[PDB]
Curated annotation (Swiss-Prot), chain A:
Range within the parent protein: 1 to 271 of 339
Role this protein plays: Negative regulator of cell wall integrity (CWI) in unstressed cells, probably by inhibiting protein kinase PKH1/PHK2 activity and regulating their downstream CWI pathways PKC1-MAP kinase pathway and protein kinase YPK1 pathway. Activity may be regulated by the transient increase of sphingolipid long chain bases (LCBs) during heat stress.
Free-text description of this protein's post-translational modifications in UniProt: Phosphorylated by PKH1 and PKH2. Phosphorylation is inhibited by sphingolipid long chain bases (LCBs).
Main location: other
Keyword Ribonucleoprotein: no
One Gene Ontology term, aspect cellular component: lipid droplet
Protein name listed in UniProt: Sphingolipid long chain base-responsive protein PIL1
Cell location: Lipid droplet
Residues recorded as bearing Phosphoserine in the entry: S16, S77, S142, S209
Molecular function in Gene Ontology: lipid binding
Keywords recorded for this protein, A-Z: Isopeptide bond, Lipid droplet, Phosphoprotein, Ubl conjugation
GO terms (BP aspect): eisosome assembly; endocytosis; protein localization; protein localization to eisosome filament
Modified residues (Phosphothreonine): T14, T212
Biased composition (Polar residues): 1-19
Amino acid sequence: MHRTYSLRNSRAPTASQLQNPPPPPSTTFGPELSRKLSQLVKIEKNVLRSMELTANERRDAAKQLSIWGLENDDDVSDITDKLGVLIYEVSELDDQFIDRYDQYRLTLKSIRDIEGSVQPSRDRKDKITDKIAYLKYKDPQSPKIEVLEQELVRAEAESLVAEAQLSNITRSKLRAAFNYQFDSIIEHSEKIALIAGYGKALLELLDDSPVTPGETRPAYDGYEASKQIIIDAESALNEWTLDSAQVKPT
Amino acid sequence: GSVQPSRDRKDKITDKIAYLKYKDPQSPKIEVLEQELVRAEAESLVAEAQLSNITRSKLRAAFNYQFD
Amino acid sequence: GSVQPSRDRKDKITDKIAYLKYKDPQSPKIEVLEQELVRAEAESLVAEAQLSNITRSKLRAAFNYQFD
């Protein structure tokens, strides 16, 4: 982030910022082992709910735009409806992305559960060690020291296997979960970019030449290109695959 | 008497996983139950050998001392 | 509607054998339960194919008649 080599929150200028000045800002108990990882889940759930609300509101706006667009000139009354139809797809994409996000959250919850179950063995080994130390302090001639040592050896073996078992699966699950999340993000971004790029061509057939008072506009006949654009967008959405990613990292 | 509780808890865990498998096979607790079952199985495997290694060793010495 | 009860009873038998296996694996009812489960599985296997063989055949004729 821009504060990498700066002490202030101001963003460093870039090529896009140099080309166009930036717009002004907008006017608007539990186990000890599993405690930091058990907090991330709540934040992810909150993100999911907020994103669902955003998608619902965007769908409502897309629905409402065509209602206003109904009572206007013939070309506007069609372009507005088609643009609303095109915008309606963003919520559909957002729903699938939310589902994949929930899958990733469950994958993380699995690791949380396994480490929370692992903790008690390392608790009990320390308890046994404290007990034998206290017994040795109080009176070295007690007979409980031998059995304490034997069960300490047993618990030490169990704890030795437990830590290796936990560390064998933590990274294995984490890598898969993050790869899945990154693939989902890439797919969502590429689909949104494709939708926007295809929708940008809808405005090319909307005339914008100024007219003087007392003149009549020519009849608008663009009911075919508008249908073709939507059909092509649907075909492109149904055709896209992960192996056909246009964005290539350098 | 100190050895017994490990063999108690292993049987308890086995009963729990069997019941969970019966009730609904799609529960996520089955995996962690299996992992801790493997851990308890290793601990119980070492415990029985440790007990049997010393039972005879102490018994023979005690009885030899008594006979002498 | 007549086909449904066979697929109901097969699931009932499966639930029963699963519960019996959970409660005590040494019961003798498990063997006869498995045998009648195999029988019901064969019957249900034939039933679904028999239903699907006639559903489309009747639907196509009915809709062709209606369209004519």
